[PDB]
Amino acid sequence: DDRYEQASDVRAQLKFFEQLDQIEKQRKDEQEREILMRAAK
Amino acid sequence: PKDAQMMAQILKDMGITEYEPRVINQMLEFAFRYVTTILDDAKIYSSHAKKATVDADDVRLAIQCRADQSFTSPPPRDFLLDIARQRNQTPLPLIKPXXXXXXX
Amino acid sequence: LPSICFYTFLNAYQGLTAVDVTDDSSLIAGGFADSTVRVXXXXXXXXXXXXXXXXXXXXXXXXXXXXXXXXXXXXXXXXKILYGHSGPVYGASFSPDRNYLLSSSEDGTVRLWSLQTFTCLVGYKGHNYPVWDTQFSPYGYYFVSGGHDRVARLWATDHYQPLRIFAGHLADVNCTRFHPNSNYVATGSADRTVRLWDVLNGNCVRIFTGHKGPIHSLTFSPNGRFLATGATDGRVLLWDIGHGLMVGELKGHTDTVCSLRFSRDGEILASGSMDNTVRLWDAIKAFEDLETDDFTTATGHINLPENSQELLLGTYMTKSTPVVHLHFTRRNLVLAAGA
Amino acid sequence: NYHLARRRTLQVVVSSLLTEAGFESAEKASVETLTEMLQSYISEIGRSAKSYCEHTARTQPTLSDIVVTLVEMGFNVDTLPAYAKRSQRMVITXXXXXXXXXXXXXXXXXXXXXXXXXXXXXXXXXXX
Amino acid sequence: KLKLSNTVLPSESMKVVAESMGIAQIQEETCQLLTDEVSYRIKEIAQDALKFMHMGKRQKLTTSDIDYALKLXXXXXXXXXXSVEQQLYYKEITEACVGSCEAKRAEALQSIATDPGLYQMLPRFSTFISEGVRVNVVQNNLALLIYLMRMVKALMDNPTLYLEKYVHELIPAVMTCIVSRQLCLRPDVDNHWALRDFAARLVAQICKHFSTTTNNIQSRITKTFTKSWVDEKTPWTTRYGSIAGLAELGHDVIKTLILPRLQQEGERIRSVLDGPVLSNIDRIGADHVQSLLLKHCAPVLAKLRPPPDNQDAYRAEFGSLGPLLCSQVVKARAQAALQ
């Protein structure tokens, strides 16, 4: 009954940074596939 | 009084210059109370040697105990042992994703 | 026209050490359990409000095609105070990619703080001892931490275990800094000697001979070739690595060389000491032989009122020089050169 | 020097609690030593909760954390409502004091002549 | 070149401290070696707290530091002193001293009071400032007067620019502002009294710095105002400026001076009051002057005498002070009750 405390938003925020890093890592893998398609171009 | 003179001689022997005297005095009084606790230890080991006097040996085991108490340092043998341990280990694994820095 | 322009920040005292990297912000390790951050030239940012709700993270991920500006949702301020320590903080720096604060307490603890939450991401130990110096790598996957217990320790981002130990001195480590390439570090200490160190085995690769007083300062060069080591003699030694030579001697700072910096790439030193003194040093010293000696009269100084100098930065990206000034107020003062 | 007033504020809290006790006189150095003991007790709470709520990967020390801290630091918390009858109901709260100001000045000459000349950095202020 | 003998406490005093707990009959060498051991640990910890504050980088040692230690053949043409730049800065200073906009006024005032190291736009500045004082004494213009006198005030508080060598063409301009005939208009003599107040206040700020030497300050200005007060058949502006300057010199100054001048200037009062047929300029002037100097002289005898027997105190002060002296004594008792 954490009606007083939130006790959140850090490991949650670490997961948010993990989400940002997952977006950037998907962008990096997409950039790898993009260079591979430029090779396929 | 005279104790301030003793501390002035100390800080001249310390060679460095600028202080507050209240710092100096509270050094003095806590140091004297450490001396009185040494005297308490002298009472104890006079009692358990069952003698009314305080020997030099009493001073010896009191300072041995309190040098075990508040006089720490890391051992250079333990330093060399830790050196052999961790410097023996030469692993350094490198990953692609590196924003994560934890598993608590 | 070399000139000391000023800044003006908040007015207090208890400042201990203060480090910047890429000029937008400085790190005032001040008030005896504190790590304050001040901002240069930008207003403020609160990137963690998008993390404050998972749906706010979801709305950020809606703009995750190409919008890093949308990552912020800046709903907070500047000049923030960051503290979980209970120690008089003794070292700090930025990550070189501006992601990871590094706080270096007395407490034994050592903490990578956030660059978006501005909280302690990770906070840990390795000592029951005062942990004097820490320093990121120039790249920053590792960093070093030298302390009280006559060791010096690498750390990863993640590994939470000392990846290497450099227990070669016999007293308090004062400074410890990376090479330009992240393999080699230097460590200077209370027992007056410098020891260089590896990355792969970690044995003491080179020793530079004890200069007659406890070390407070050391630098490397932007080409990664040369050394300044300033000591309590008021005295700088230009060292070289592969020849291991005490090349150059500089003196007159009157006894506590706190801030050394080989500036923008050429041999133009910035230097500063306790008695509110800053000397440049225009001294192009370069040779290769068996033994050597030199002489004085390179450059002249510039002074200050009562504000001794914690650290210093030869300006990354410009011929400029900011310093940090703490006996009055947290005033970063900026000055130039050009002889 | 300027730190000291919070310590003497704690001395005021000490005198308030002695007034609630009812001591007419006291020994001054003992009083200030007890004040030091009080602030060290505060810091002892803070060290305990500090290293105790780092046992979560997150930081924020909540109520039950400090409950387990004070029971760990030896206190029967059941008297805390009843001590409220003594604390905020029989002693008047003292107010703090902090008088900070930012004075005004003007030294207007008319010369800058190099805003961000060759060493270009748009974070400075050229003097005159 | 140095000898560090052991700071050893006298062991008899140590036995007094020991047997204060009532231990035993103690031999000397025991307490001698005890003082030795404790001195070793103290001086070790002293080196340790030095290592603390020489990385916290302050040369003063607090209690808190040791608390953290307890974790165990035609010549070339001339060139002036000025630059063209700073003489134009000087021209800005002068025309802001003219300045109608009070923002420009206060800007000038702050620029005076806080340009240390200026020192070289000194005397030439102040010299024909004093010459302008003389010329506008002739011109008899209060605005230039108040501008110059606040200018001298701001000159007095710029702490680096030492007055000593350049004193002796400034102070007579102040006293010429004190003495007489500041008569723009006869119904507008009102502001000139406040000018004299401010001027004597400035003299009071002068006198606390320079009379250690040659006693031009105290002895000459006191005897000046002495024989000036003696000067019969002079305008009462002279009398007001004299007595106000003596008032600004201090409590004991007036205690000396207006001890006979209490009833002698009361004789001057009732020579003025209930005096002439008609000269209401001089009547109203001298009347408010006597009133001002009355209740301004009042705190001396208020600090001197107790406030009893106001009817007798008026007899002790020639009547005309009564009961304005008694009303001021009531005001002084109220000011004491404010404490």
From Swiss-Prot, chain A:
Subcellular location per the Swiss-Prot or TrEMBL entry: Nucleus
Family designation: Belongs to the TAF4 family.
Known disease link: Intellectual developmental disorder, autosomal dominant 73: An autosomal dominant disorder characterized by intellectual disability ranging from mild to severe, developmental delay, speech delay, behavioral abnormalities, and non-specific dysmorphic facial features.
Function: The TFIID basal transcription factor complex plays a major role in the initiation of RNA polymerase II (Pol II)-dependent transcription. TFIID recognizes and binds promoters with or without a TATA box via its subunit TBP, a TATA-box-binding protein, and promotes assembly of the pre-initiation complex (PIC). The TFIID complex consists of TBP and TBP-associated factors (TAFs), including TAF1, TAF2, TAF3, TAF4, TAF5, TAF6, TAF7, TAF8, TAF9, TAF10, TAF11, TAF12 and TAF13.
Quaternary state and interactors: Component of the TFIID basal transcription factor complex, composed of TATA-box-binding protein TBP, and a number of TBP-associated factors (TAFs), including TAF1, TAF2, TAF3, TAF4, TAF5, TAF6, TAF7, TAF8, TAF9, TAF10, TAF11, TAF12 and TAF13. Component of the TFTC-HAT complex, at least composed of TAF5L, TAF6L, TADA3L, SUPT3H, TAF2, TAF4, TAF5, GCN5L2/GCN5, TAF10, TAF12 and TRRAP.
Entry protein name: Transcription initiation factor TFIID subunit 4
Source organism of the structure: Homo sapiens (Human)
Gene: TAF4
Swiss-Prot record, chain B:
Disulphide bridges, residue numbers: none
Keyword Transcription in annotation: yes
Subcellular compartments: Nucleus
Induction summary: 6 to 8-fold by apoptotic signals.
The keyword Iron-sulfur is annotated on this UniProt entry: no
GO terms assigned for molecular function: ATPase binding; C2H2 zinc finger domain binding; DNA binding; DNA-binding transcription factor binding; p53 binding; protein heterodimerization activity; RNA polymerase II general transcription initiation factor activity; transcription cis-regulatory region binding
GO cellular component, as recorded: MLL1 complex; nucleoplasm; nucleus; pre-snoRNP complex; SAGA complex; transcription factor TFIID complex; transcription factor TFTC complex
Domain of life (superkingdom): Eukaryota
Entry keywords, A to Z: Acetylation, DNA-binding, Nucleus, Phosphoprotein, Transcription, Transcription regulation
GO biological process: box C/D snoRNP assembly; chromatin remodeling; DNA damage response; mRNA transcription by RNA polymerase II; negative regulation of apoptotic process; negative regulation of intrinsic apoptotic signaling pathway in response to DNA damage by p53 class mediator; negative regulation of proteasomal ubiquitin-dependent protein catabolic process; positive regulation of DNA-templated transcription
Recorded family membership: Belongs to the TAF9 family.
Protein name as it appears in the record: Transcription initiation factor TFIID subunit 9
Lineage: Eukaryota, Metazoa, Chordata, Craniata, Vertebrata
Gene symbol of the encoding locus: TAF9
From Swiss-Prot, chain C:
Top-level taxonomic group: Eukaryota
Disulfide bonds: none
WD repeat intervals: 11-39, 84-123, 126-167, 168-209, 210-249, 252-291
Localization annotation: Nucleus
Function: The TFIID basal transcription factor complex plays a major role in the initiation of RNA polymerase II (Pol II)-dependent transcription. TFIID recognizes and binds promoters with or without a TATA box via its subunit TBP, a TATA-box-binding protein, and promotes assembly of the pre-initiation complex (PIC). The TFIID complex consists of TBP and TBP-associated factors (TAFs), including TAF1, TAF2, TAF3, TAF4, TAF5, TAF6, TAF7, TAF8, TAF9, TAF10, TAF11, TAF12 and TAF13. The TFIID complex structure can be divided into 3 modules TFIID-A, TFIID-B, and TFIID-C.
Domain free text: Distinct domains of TAF5/TAFII100 are required for functional interaction with transcription factor TFIIFB (RAP30) and incorporation into the TFIID complex.
Family: Belongs to the WD repeat TAF5 family.
Protein name: Transcription initiation factor TFIID subunit 5
Gene that specifies this protein: TAF5
From Swiss-Prot, chain E:
An example Gene Ontology CC term for this record: MLL1 complex
Principal localisation: nucleus
Residues modified to Phosphothreonine: 114
GO terms, molecular function: aryl hydrocarbon receptor binding; DNA binding; protein heterodimerization activity; RNA polymerase II general transcription initiation factor activity; transcription coactivator activity
Compartment annotation: Nucleus
Described function: The TFIID basal transcription factor complex plays a major role in the initiation of RNA polymerase II (Pol II)-dependent transcription. TFIID recognizes and binds promoters with or without a TATA box via its subunit TBP, a TATA-box-binding protein, and promotes assembly of the pre-initiation complex (PIC). The TFIID complex consists of TBP and TBP-associated factors (TAFs), including TAF1, TAF2, TAF3, TAF4, TAF5, TAF6, TAF7, TAF8, TAF9, TAF10, TAF11, TAF12 and TAF13. The TFIID complex structure can be divided into 3 modules TFIID-A, TFIID-B, and TFIID-C.
The protein, known as: Transcription initiation factor TFIID subunit 6
